[PDB]
Design an enzyme around this catalytic site. Structure first.
Site, short mmCIF file in Angstrom:
data_model
loop_
_atom_site.label_atom_id
_atom_site.label_comp_id
_atom_site.label_asym_id
_atom_site.label_seq_id
_atom_site.Cartn_x
_atom_site.Cartn_y
_atom_site.Cartn_z
N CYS A 81 9.32 -41.54 -27.13
CA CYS A 81 10.26 -41.54 -26.09
C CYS A 81 10.02 -40.97 -24.64
CB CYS A 81 11.65 -41.26 -26.68
SG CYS A 81 12.16 -39.55 -26.39
N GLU A 119 14.34 -48.28 -32.46
CA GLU A 119 15.26 -47.09 -32.11
C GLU A 119 14.71 -46.51 -30.96
OE1 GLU A 119 14.36 -43.70 -32.79
OE2 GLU A 119 15.80 -42.86 -31.57
N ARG A 163 24.47 -37.13 -30.46
CA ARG A 163 23.17 -37.75 -30.31
C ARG A 163 23.42 -39.08 -29.97
NH1 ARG A 163 18.02 -35.13 -32.23
NH2 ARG A 163 16.47 -36.58 -32.47
N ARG A 165 21.90 -42.75 -28.92
CA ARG A 165 20.64 -43.35 -28.94
C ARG A 165 20.92 -44.81 -28.82
NH1 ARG A 165 19.57 -39.01 -28.16
NH2 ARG A 165 17.83 -37.68 -29.10
#
Ligand SMILES: *C[S@@+](CC[C@H](N)C(=O)[O-])C[C@H]1O[C@@H](n2cnc3c(N)ncnc32)[C@H](O)[C@@H]1O
EC number: 2.1.1.37
Length: 327
Positions: A81, A119, A163, A165
């Site tokens: 990422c 993800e 968090r 995502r």
DNA sequence: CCATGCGCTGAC
DNA sequence: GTCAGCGCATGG
């Protein structure tokens, strides 16, 4: 992690790409599936993996021949990422670390598995005015798959961590799946204070600085949000201090600052950072998982990983859809 | 390899 | 105007 009684994925096989600590493996195995291949190129990550599962993953995916990979039902992948994060330079597909998605596509063309589970960070859905996400959706459509995606926050699934995502689920068209759904949120009842170790075991992480500037008082009741209490230096990344009566800030892999990668917290009158085991807990890992002997590699590994609990709920829902076959 | 001061972007 | 971020850059 959570305990699953109804093992919806019994009999199915999967492969673990960009493996890391094996967060995708713990989640799917708990639902009854079996792992038949793993790939990861970092020396230190291959060591913890082997310590916990008893096998060494293969290296560099860009030079592996896609026809040598074993037959399987589900492909898993939490790809790099740095090229898409709001904390980096946002170079996207122009970045040498930003092209890994096309290697996945190469594998999907040959093996044609039933499900693709991926993800990445929240900014992925917004990057380049939405072009990056459309490119991914069109490629999957062209390979004969449907596309479902949504952003989920860990604090809504019982883990005290902010968090956010993006999760992408894809089904092969000939299966005709029409009832898949992302899990529903529930109320949070555990806070940072409930996961901490005894004072005696964490003495060495205490930091006493003279530029400490409190800007808020400790709160008296718990809450599902991050509560900043003070700052050191100029207040940049790694120089912010939070309350243990609230939730934790997202963990990172390459972060800096005096309270690097975990952030600082006010505990029983002192300011300190988190211990590797406490990092395991806020990521949903069980106390029986063995961490890397090097404290430096351990923080980097947890900062790159996934929250186990969130993946368990998603995986159960994938199985439920696959099993609904009426006459 | 390891430690730590930074400086800008996105979404309010 | 305020605040957070599976990060970058350079020293030993
Ligand atoms: C960001 S991270 C995945 C974490 C994992 N989901 C977890 O810990 O549970 C990404 C990983 O990918 C590895 N990597 C990067 N490039 C390659 C290539 N080309 N070949 C193999 N592996 C690669 C990173 O080391 C990181 O662990």
């Amino acid at each position: 992690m959570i305990e699953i009684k109804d093992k919806q994925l019994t009999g199915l096989r999967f492969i673990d790409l960009f493996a890391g600590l094996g967060g995708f493996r713990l989640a799917l195995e708990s639902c009854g599936a079996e792992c038949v291949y793993s790939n990861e190129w970092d020396k230190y990550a291959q060591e913890v993996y082997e310590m916990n599962f008893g096998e060494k993953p293969e290296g560099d995916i860009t030079q592996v021949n896609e026809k040598t990979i074993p037959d399987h039902d589900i492909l898993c992948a939490g790809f790099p990422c740095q090229a898409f994060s709001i904390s980096g330079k946002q170079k996207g597909f122009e970045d040498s670390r930003g092209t890994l998605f096309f290697d996945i596509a190469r594998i999907v063309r040959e093996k044609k598995p039933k499900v693709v589970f991926m993800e990445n960070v929240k900014n992925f859905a917004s990057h380049d005015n939405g072009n990056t996400l459309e490119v991914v959706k069109n490629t999957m459509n062209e390979l004969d798959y449907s596309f479902h995606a949504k952003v989920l926050n860990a604090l809504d699934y019982g883990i005290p961590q902010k968090r956010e995502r993006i999760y992408m689920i894809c089904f092969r068209n000939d299966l005709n799946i029409q009832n898949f759904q992302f899990p529903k949120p529930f109320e949070l009842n555990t806070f940072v204070k409930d996961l901490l170790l005894p004072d005696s075991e964490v003495e060495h992480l205490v930091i006493d600085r003279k530029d400490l500037v409190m800007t808020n008082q400790e709160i008296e009741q718990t809450t599902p949000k991050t509560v900043r209490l003070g700052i050191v230096g100029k207040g940049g990344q790694g120089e912010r201090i939070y309350s243990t009566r609230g939730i934790a800030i997202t963990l990172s892999a390459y972060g800096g600052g005096i309270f690097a990668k975990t952030g600082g917290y006010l505990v029983n009158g002192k300011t300190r950072k988190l211990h590797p085991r406490e990092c395991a807990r806020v990521m949903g890992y069980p106390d029986s998982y063995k961490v890397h002997p090097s404290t430096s590699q351990a923080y980097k590994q947890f900062g790159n990983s996934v929250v186990i609990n969130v993946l368990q709920y998603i995986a159960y829902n994938i199985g439920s859809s696959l099993n609904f076959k009426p006459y």
